[PDB]
Design a protein around this motif. Sequence first.
Motif, PDB file in Angstrom:
ATOM      1  N   UNK B  90      39.993  -9.658   7.518  1.00  0.00           N
ATOM      2  CA  UNK B  90      41.176  -9.073   8.129  1.00  0.00           C
ATOM      3  C   UNK B  90      42.460  -9.722   7.615  1.00  0.00           C
ATOM      4  N   UNK B 152      40.728 -15.044  13.344  1.00  0.00           N
ATOM      5  CA  UNK B 152      41.940 -14.266  13.095  1.00  0.00           C
ATOM      6  C   UNK B 152      42.024 -13.071  14.035  1.00  0.00           C
ATOM      7  N   UNK B 153      40.913 -12.356  14.203  1.00  0.00           N
ATOM      8  CA  UNK B 153      40.912 -11.213  15.104  1.00  0.00           C
ATOM      9  C   UNK B 153      41.147 -11.639  16.546  1.00  0.00           C
ATOM     10  N   UNK B 156      44.726 -12.434  17.076  1.00  0.00           N
ATOM     11  CA  UNK B 156      45.523 -11.219  17.188  1.00  0.00           C
ATOM     12  C   UNK B 156      45.375 -10.592  18.570  1.00  0.00           C
ATOM     13  N   UNK B 157      44.138 -10.470  19.065  1.00  0.00           N
ATOM     14  CA  UNK B 157      43.947  -9.894  20.395  1.00  0.00           C
ATOM     15  C   UNK B 157      44.666 -10.715  21.450  1.00  0.00           C
ATOM     16  N   UNK B 160      48.464 -10.153  21.223  1.00  0.00           N
ATOM     17  CA  UNK B 160      48.929  -8.776  21.386  1.00  0.00           C
ATOM     18  C   UNK B 160      49.841  -8.566  22.592  1.00  0.00           C
ATOM     19  N   UNK B 163      53.335 -10.263  21.986  1.00  0.00           N
ATOM     20  CA  UNK B 163      54.121  -9.462  21.053  1.00  0.00           C
ATOM     21  C   UNK B 163      54.643  -8.198  21.727  1.00  0.00           C
ATOM     22  N   UNK B 171      56.432 -13.604  15.317  1.00  0.00           N
ATOM     23  CA  UNK B 171      55.341 -14.575  15.258  1.00  0.00           C
ATOM     24  C   UNK B 171      54.540 -14.355  13.984  1.00  0.00           C
ATOM     25  N   UNK B 173      51.435 -15.434  12.100  1.00  0.00           N
ATOM     26  CA  UNK B 173      50.152 -15.932  12.575  1.00  0.00           C
ATOM     27  C   UNK B 173      49.263 -16.241  11.373  1.00  0.00           C
TER      28      UNK B 173
END
Lengths: 397, 546
Positions: B90, B152-153, B156-157, B160, B163, B171, B173
């Motif tokens: 990803x 990484x996923x 992100x979750x 979320x 953001x 941000x 990341x």
Amino acid sequence: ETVPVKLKPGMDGPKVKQWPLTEEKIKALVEICTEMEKEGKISKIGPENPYNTPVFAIKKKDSTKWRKLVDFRELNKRTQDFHPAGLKKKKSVTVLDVGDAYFSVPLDEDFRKYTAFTIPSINNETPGIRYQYNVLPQGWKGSPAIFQSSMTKILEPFRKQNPDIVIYQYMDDLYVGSDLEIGQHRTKIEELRQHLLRWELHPDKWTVQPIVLPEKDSWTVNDIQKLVGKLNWASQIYPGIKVRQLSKLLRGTKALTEVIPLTEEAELELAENREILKEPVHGVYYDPSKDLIAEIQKQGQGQWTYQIYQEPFKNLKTGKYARMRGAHTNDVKQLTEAVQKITTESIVIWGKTPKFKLPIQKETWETWWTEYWQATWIPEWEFVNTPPLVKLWYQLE
Amino acid sequence: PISPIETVPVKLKPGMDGPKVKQWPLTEEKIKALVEICTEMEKEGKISKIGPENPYNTPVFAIKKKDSTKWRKLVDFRELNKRTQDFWEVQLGIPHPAGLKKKKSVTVLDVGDAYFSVPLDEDFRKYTAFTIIRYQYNVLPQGWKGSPAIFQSSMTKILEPFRKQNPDIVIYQYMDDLYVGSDLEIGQHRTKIEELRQHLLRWGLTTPDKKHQKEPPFLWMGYELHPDKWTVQPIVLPEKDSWTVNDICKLVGKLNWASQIYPGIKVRQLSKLLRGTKALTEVIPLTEEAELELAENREILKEPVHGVYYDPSKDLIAEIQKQGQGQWTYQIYQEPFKNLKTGKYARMRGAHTNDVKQLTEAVQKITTESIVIWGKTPKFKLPIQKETWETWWTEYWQATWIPEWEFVNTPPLVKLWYQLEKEPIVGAETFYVDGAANRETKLGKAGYVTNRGRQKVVTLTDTTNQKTELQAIYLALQDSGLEVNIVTDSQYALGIIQAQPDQSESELVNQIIEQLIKKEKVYLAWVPAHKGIGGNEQVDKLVSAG
DNA sequence: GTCCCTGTTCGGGCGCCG
DNA sequence: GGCGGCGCCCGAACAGGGACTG
Ligand SMILES: Nc1ccn([C@@H]2CS[C@H](COP(=O)(O)OP(=O)(O)OP(=O)(O)O)O2)c(=O)n1
Ligand SMILES: [Mg+2]
Ligand SMILES: [Mg+2]
């Protein structure tokens, strides 16, 4: 109520990397995918799904509304599949986007993993955001196949009441053809649009343009050498072509600029060859199993030539695409419009798109073709260095 | 702690079973650190004691961290990795400082024990068993294939919502690094940073103060970020007196890294120092051109240099310059002499090429890189005349195109060094050229016959049909006058010379190019071979003594 | 079929990041 | 000594395509 979908017998799903997207397209895709996720049509996935196909966006014609386009070419190659000859013979044909109807039919759960795509990030602010489809996706071979029974139910009364009309579905679009006057045809198309809600093409000008030989009243050695080379190439297509009498005109080590009168024996041969290029190619039968090959040659100054064949020299169709000779000419834009026109013509004539041989470096095309793409489908293509002789053979005067 | 986030379901590739590798013996200096780590991890529920119920095992070890007082625990999971399912990676690229926008307030946070704070699939923990005591992982281990993507996923979750409800906060990341930028005054920025830290805490993720950068210059992704300048951390080039292949690779890699802000870096000679090598432990003698190129690179590196941040309200300008031998440097900027970044393009494509094709390739690379970093194509400033480019786009049978650009007169200008006539030349002597070679004997002959009765045939050994055709054209060019018409039967030589190359990896083609440059008018024409076309037939008979 | 030439892909080094 | 990402550069493997032998 869903339909099970099997892949190729021994192949996997698509693992195509996502290419870079401009900020405009990323913003549009993020807006569209938020709206789609809300409605349940797509949902977020993670890296445990090992598949990916590329996504981008195209701005529609005379519109501010972007359209999400998923390049399902790899997926379409790997889903084993489960056409009216008179449509090309109609006076008018209108192309109608009927894609989003697919979003009413759910997609088989086991198959959903294969429709994964990844929205990228400007300057890789974040890792990619991954989604997969929960309904029939726009751009996939299986969507019109699964929806076909529902589509035939939709179109039954319209076909019954309008038997002179020819409606043909290719993946995301209907092709509606008739012989009515432009205005009455448009009114019938609006009838059909209202029918769809209740739930610019003329195949006559499509001329098979021949191979033409230069007409001159004065021939240099150079001219006759060019003509003998062209005819020796064209005899690979029309075996009845003779060169003997013209070739005899060259005996000796003559200057290229030297003038050569045409002997009556050779002028008759040139006339015979001119007539031979008028009759069609013999032994050319369309094969639905083998796929279509389309070559394109850049002729220069807004002019492009193309051939559609399956085996070499058995051309199913030759043609030209002629754009305006302008100051700021965009070769990539012209080539993109040309492949779109050729693919439309093939979908209308034979019912399948051709694999394209594109006379362009791979990187220029991959960098800019999306900026000019306007169709909902995408043909297959490869990149070839066109030999200097093929262009010379197919060019016009 | 351990994030309460849902776990990511992982399977082995179908049919495979977990690893059963025996534990490699280690020193005491690593056993001590690994015991000190594993006791605290098993207390914290991050690893769990496994019994005789698990038949699997994998070797472990430990290395010193970036700060040499702390140990990082690794597991040689190569077997499990080979047996683990496929992931879709990803992380699509590496964020670049030139794509950052000026921000009033900047923070850099480092997540503490990142992997060891994300849980692992319960059905998959049995395969992660190791031994020092036999444990198994309950969190992401380092050395497993799936850990970077899954982290990484999950990051992100986790980010979320924050953001979503802080759009004006940026941000960046990078996998546990968090760059956080805002235009908020320092007080409210620090408040939001506290919100972001407490939010990460509610999802099990700690931001230790020791790795919490608060004042510039910020250390990030290998750069130093100042309020409106950015630099790279120092680049130490090795000064080795005997050079090995590994040393050349390290040097060229460091030079490639430097070329993102240091202009005019060249590595072509140092890279050619590799052609057909053996291994990392072969000493290579530096050629004179390589020594000079390295001296130039060094003198570049001893110069203060910085980049600036992106301003979205001003234009992206990419200016390119021609270096020698298929090398090109470029500068992307918005205000003159204030570079966003620099770059190089030195990839050799095609056995035969010219500078217009190479320039087009560079323009393409820079365009795609610009879309990745800023999401815009830049406006180009190229050392090529608009007339030169149109002439090329006319005469060239491939679709080529370059976005908006304007000429810049900084030599070396890109030029076509010769043109081929579109029509045969009146008064020019007409050379019919040909050549042949015997596949078995490898001997050949090349020659020409002119309309004025000149004849020449020349014997060649250790040649091919194609080389013999190029040699015939070379003979004609050498012996002709300033204007000439040439008639060949070789689509190969035709295609090469029609492409108008100015450089080639074939010495014969280079000589042909020099001769073509010397001429005033050249017309090249093609006839099919073995067709009795005079006077191609006379040359054909002449050069076939075999 | 063979030989020659040429362009593409991919894996192996190293660089940078975490 | 492990992992993932991207970058560069090299050579090995391979895929067309033109020209050739008897
Ligand atoms: N060479 C490397 C470097 C990092 N990593 C991975 C990817 S990011 C993660 C970072 O390690 P940790 O979570 O233990 O945190 P740190 O080492 O930075 O310390 P603290 O922040 O003090 O808690 O380790 C790796 O796999 N290989
Ligand atoms: Mg950390
Ligand atoms: Mg020959």
